[PDB]
Design a protein around this ligand. Structure first.
Ligand SMILES: Cc1ncc(Cn2c(C)c(CCOP(=O)(O)OP(=O)(O)O)sc2=O)c(N)n1
Ligand SMILES: Cc1ncc(Cn2c(C)c(CCOP(=O)(O)OP(=O)(O)O)sc2=O)c(N)n1
Ligand SMILES: Cc1ncc(Cn2c(C)c(CCOP(=O)(O)OP(=O)(O)O)sc2=O)c(N)n1
Ligand SMILES: [Ca+2]
Ligand SMILES: [Ca+2]
Ligand SMILES: [Ca+2]
Ligand SMILES: [Ca+2]
Ligand SMILES: [Ca+2]
Ligand SMILES: [Ca+2]
Ligand code: NA
Ligand code: NA
Lengths: 525, 525, 525
């Protein structure tokens, strides 16, 4: 068998059937004779390729396979890799290298010192020492991406390797099963459960690895048994809990002092599937107030090591959430009372307040919609106003890197063809990965893109306020016609300058058979 | 003085007055109180920021200063850095980091292991150990980018550093002058000159560092004195010689055997300012034929080390070209005869042959036009058909990385306001950095963008032919309306479906007062 | 509190009370005011410092703390770090850096790009961005070294940081408990147990992480219940099983074909706590024969990923071994029969055969002796001839790096003051870390060093035979007087030129109150 045949067999035997790519000449010997059971999803720029693959992997809860061109293609994707690293996204990033005979002379398209290029944003990065090693290196890449804590990995392959003979012993790779589905030993798990059972006023904080593990329902059972309020850890990349469940208390503020004040009076705080904590603004004070102790369950040793307070347990989130939910006692405390609905903000017949947009989306969207957020100044209102009952209903760029939501929304929609995806993206953020729209048009992936157009980088005006920073250039982005950009890439486009038009546009978009972009005129901050 | 005040003083004293950027919150404390003598050039995505800065630096022949946001912003720019590394572009890339007090907890927007992120595509990469060190680190960055061999450098700065007190000894940084303008010692230079004077049939090969050094005129004098044919080294990022001078012989084929056959019968081949050689296709054979010896002058030790043949001298290209041109004897051989004009290809009243496009551009463009090429399947025809008399008249992505020409053409036009810039870009390549168009509209930078629309990744069809690779996915890019994309970003747009319309569109574009995009319907390969 | 006071408090609260070091000026501000409850163990060269700390950590089963001088001190230790990486040794390596104010100018003793220096041989490598971050960075280092898979970590600290004020919130670091004591979820553990219970002819292979976890007794119970033969995985750094238990089958040959032939006919092979596999010689063939399937339990994702065959489970070895031993059925198969004793090799009254040395050590040493091996050509005979009943009885350089056993034997003896340590070291290997002898003399650590003196690098003669490599320089090491070297460093020394003298020397050494070196004249290969 050839290295080409052996590698595609390994991929299919490991459950991979889709290649997200932007091709180049170092990759043509891999992509030739493309197998009939695989599909190739083309995107026009590599940040878009990786963003699409990332949304697909996060929604599918399985690894996604990417093929990029050498150093330039890899490099164009590295902002997308920064988000994937923070979201623990299982991405297998492959890039083609020059033929082995010209690597030394650094022919055009040689990826020099290739394995160092995507570091430090990958769990594993490698170029094989021979063609016959390629399938074994691909096997390492698959398992490295997929083991807890999941994350992106990188493999560089010289183009001449594909046609070489494979090692006949490579067949032992095909059906390897690797598990990291582990939980704390019985004795120490019993100690933890007793501490939870004994707590007088517990609180629960959930992060994105809960939603990645589909541990959401087990966390609902846990919160109901402990009769405990539940918050989502700050800077949330996913939604790990039903947002109208009576225990839900919302998104935590991303500040040290704000979090310790919120948790004051809670004697035990159990954090599951989150870093402790992804603070953002610098809000110095106590990490925890006297009387509060913290216990973190994380799938990532790096998170356990860097927490500034608390105990930690490094284990699989799915296995731990299931075990805790089934072992804790039902507390005799009263179940927390649901938060009140948000107030309606006053809205005239002009430009839309973001609150009006989210209320209207909540009114009109299906109950199993999936939302993506890259509307950076409106995140708090979004979390208050969208009822997200189901797992996999929310994505936000995990490293704060713009250019995620537009392509990721296409990958999520590909992963979840029966759930309507609605990406809410600011006019600034929309530009970073604008060409991803073409992939939605070409493959008819029916994502709805809602562009919140207020003419400015609004969140940067906010942070400038926090810092008291004046005379800052580069904050305004006037003069972008998003309906023309959508037309440019073949996507149907609508404009909403007021509430009547927003409702009409959403009705049309929800009825459409393909992707739709709605440009919404929102109020300037 | 503050670190902020001291750093801007260092920048202005070192000749820097422009910041190319896309802002974020870690950068607001740097950008606040922006000095009135500086300008800020915003672009909407970081590949575009860096591409604009790169064209500006290459055309200006001086360092350009960039400010990006943390890891995601840096990462979005790394494909652009791969081109800048190959073109020896003096780019000072700065990125904002989290405040020092939250780096350890890895708050959102922390750039983890920052200096490793852009490696291996930078000459120097650093994060200072204290705020007071920031001006000295910026001084290192400026000089590292600017010394031969020039190249990109990276500096990560925690946002809290800017408001701290500077070291009063930082003033010694302001006026430092660092020179690498060096040439081979007299005795060995005399040996070289004698070898050139004695050669019976010399040839000259020039690369991009000739144009970077503005050594073009000295190379013309050298070729005239030696009565030697002149070729441009393969995969050329710049044009180092007048293309209708009688000695000019064109762009070398990027293959080992093709180059040794071309040079057969030349006893001494002098390569100046090029890697030896930037081959592309694998065309195995002799590096040089018997009877040919090679001497390379390069500004880059890495190039001298990796050449597979020949002697090398590591020195400044400007200083060496001037010394050789002034020291060699005038040979009594006859001056080479100019190459014949290219033939006119048959053109009907339908879609345009690329040859027709280049002939028409050559007919209509000013004699001091500047061209950029990202029309990958038409490069040979472009080099045959455009008369480029002057230095700084041609740019092509030095690492082969798509997404360079569109933004770089805006930076070149900013650097050269009195020379009309004409970027010739394929329909595939146009998407990688499409949002750069907005910067041309906003700042009214009057670049002309000629989109060669043939619906496919044509060069990848070509390389597939070379490899004999069939059943390759992802090679077609139908369904892009470039006039709508231009409208989206505020740029006037024209379409040319035939020759009459191409001439009319070019006449309108050349008369316009702002940037213009022309979508040209070209023949499918 | 100062950073100095806070850091020592963190160390003592995390169970660290010993610093293994070789001092320098960047470290004096850390070592000053050394706390009265800590001890400092000086060694004269850094390979020795790290080797001593490594033996101490491996025998104690807890992290060891090291302090080295800048880049040169770190660099002198990097061969020792290569062994520590392979043995999963929990080592916290700290190195002093220049004061922050002169790092930029690269004053003498600046460790440039410090975190990159020990890569790729560390799990985590870091230099803090401010003095107040130092305790939190030390906390990260402690937990990173200690979490599964354990391994070395590196922290570089500018010398001026120690006297700065600590963050008052650093107290939350002191009592953090971090656990990785996890095992496979119940459902999948039940599937594994059923596969073991159903196997017709199981085999067990154990590696060093069994001994690190003190899982040895649980593995004995497991082997007795399954009535299965037990081998030690190749290139063994530790002994995970009693070597005269009836199930024991010895050290596996370090070859692909040799291992698959050994395992032929075993239907399920369970590997616990080993890479699959640490082959050495290239012995190509089948990874496993038809009819054999493999299941690996490893604490290290990198091991699970790179195995060329089998299923894998990534979990704590102690937790998994205990669970399996307690859950499997008692098989009705007959218990394996013990291997026969080794034969006595013919020995005349001259130089000693290594077999005679090991037989005599086995006869005379206490039953709870601990052996270290760096006698590279005699490893197979050592494993056949020493009855090692107890855990923690054997250490061998895990990366094959010479210079481990001599210093590690001193650290093991410090960790286990009531178990006599006997290091068996070749005359070649003894030189790499010879100065470690001084630490044994100074602190009166009563290790016995047995130098096998045959005048040559015997194993390299063996491998030369395998390769059929002739005319190789540098294989002989004549002219070393090991009694004089021992005298040089203050250690009592004896010579044994024949068996009578070997017995007399061992009797004297075993009766001594301090360290003793015995130079044994062994037969030339
Ligand atoms: C790759 C990249 N570049 C720049 C930024 C900085 N950035 C930027 C540019 C923001 C403004 C986004 O504007 P928007 O129009 O999408 O939304 P708002 O107006 O609601 O802020 S928020 C933010 O952190 C970033 N996070 N990522
Ligand atoms: C960042 C990046 N991604 C992908 C490629 C691969 N690539 C691609 C995608 C080419 C096709 C360009 O198509 P075009 O329309 O711009 O021009 P032609 O039709 O004349 O080839 S040529 C080439 O090397 C690349 N060089 N750089
Ligand atoms: C740091 C280092 N350098 C060199 C070697 C190579 N090496 C060497 C030099 C060996 C010979 C050891 O000789 P010895 O006297 O200790 O024992 P034998 O005579 O029994 O081989 S075995 C081996 O792998 C090594 N493993 N580690
Ligand atoms: Ca099919
Ligand atoms: Ca906005
Ligand atoms: Ca001004
Ligand atoms: Ca094209
Ligand atoms: Ca004491
Ligand atoms: Ca020896
Ligand atoms: Na990198
Ligand atoms: Na290193």
């Amino acid at each position: 068998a050839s290295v080409h045949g052996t590698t595609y067999e390994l991929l299919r035997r490991q459950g991979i059937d889709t290649v997200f790519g932007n091709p180049g000449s170092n990759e043509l010997p891999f992509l030739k004779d493309f197998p009939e059971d695989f599909r190739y999803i083309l995107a026009l720029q590599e940040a878009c390729v990786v963003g699409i693959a990332d949304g697909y992997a996060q929604a599918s809860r399985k690894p996604a396979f990417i093929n990029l061109h050498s150093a330039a293609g890899t490099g164009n994707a590295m902002g997308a890799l920064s988000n994937a690293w923070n979201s623990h996204s299982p991405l297998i990033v492959t890039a083609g290298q020059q033929t082995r005979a010209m690597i030394g002379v650094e022919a055009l398209l040689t990826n020099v010192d290739a394995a160092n290029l995507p570091r430090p944003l990958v769990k594993w990065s490698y170029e094989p020492a021979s063609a016959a090693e390629v399938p074994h290196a691909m096997s390492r890449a698959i398992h490295m991406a997929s083991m807890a804590p999941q994350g992106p990995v990188y493999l560089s392959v010289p183009y001449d390797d594909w046609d070489k003979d494979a090692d006949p012993q490579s067949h032992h790779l095909f059906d390897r099963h690797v598990s990291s589905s582990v939980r704390l030993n019985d004795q120490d798990l019993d100690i933890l459960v007793k501490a939870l059972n004994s707590a007088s006023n517990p609180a629960i904080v959930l992060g994105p690895d809960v939603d990645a593990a589909n541990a959401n329902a087990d966390c609902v059972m846990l919160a109901e048994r402990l009769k405990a309020p539940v918050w989502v850890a700050p800077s949330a990349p996913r939604c790990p809990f039903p947002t109208r469940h009576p225990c839900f208390r919302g998104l935590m503020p991303a500040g040290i002092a704000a979090i310790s004040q919120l948790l004051e009076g809670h004697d035990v705080v159990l954090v599951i599937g989150a870093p402790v904590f992804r603070y953002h603004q610098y809000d110095p004070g106590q990490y925890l107030k006297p009387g509060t102790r913290l216990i973190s369950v994380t799938c990532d040793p790096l998170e356990a090591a860097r927490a500034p307070m608390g105990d930690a347990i490094v284990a699989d989130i799915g296995a731990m959430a299931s075990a805790l939910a089934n072992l804790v006692e039902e507390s005799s405390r009263q179940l927390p009372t649901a938060a009140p609905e948000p107030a309606k903000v006053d809205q005239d017949a002009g430009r839309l307040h973001p609150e009006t947009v989210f209320d209207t989306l909540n009114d009109m969207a299906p109950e199993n919609a999936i939302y993506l957020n890259e509307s950076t100044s409106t995140t708090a209102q979004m979390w208050q106003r969208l009822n997200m009952r189901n797992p996999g209903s929310y994505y936000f760029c995990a490293a704060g890197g713009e250019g995620f939501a537009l392509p990721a929304a296409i990958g999520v929609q590909l992963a979840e063809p029966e759930r309507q995806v609605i990406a809410v993206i600011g006019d600034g953020s929309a530009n970073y990965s604008i060409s991803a729209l073409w992939t939605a048009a070409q493959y008819n992936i029916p994502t709805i893109f809602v562009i919140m157009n207020n003419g400015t980088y609004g969140a940067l005006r906010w942070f400038a306020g926090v810092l008291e920073a004046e005379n800052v250039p580069g904050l305004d982005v006037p003069g972008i016609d998003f309906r023309a950009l959508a037309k440019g890439y073949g996507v149907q486009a609508l404009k909403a300058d007021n509430l009547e038009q927003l409702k009409g546009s959403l009705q049309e978009a929800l009825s459409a058979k393909g992707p739709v972009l709605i440009e919404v005129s929102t109020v300037s901050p």
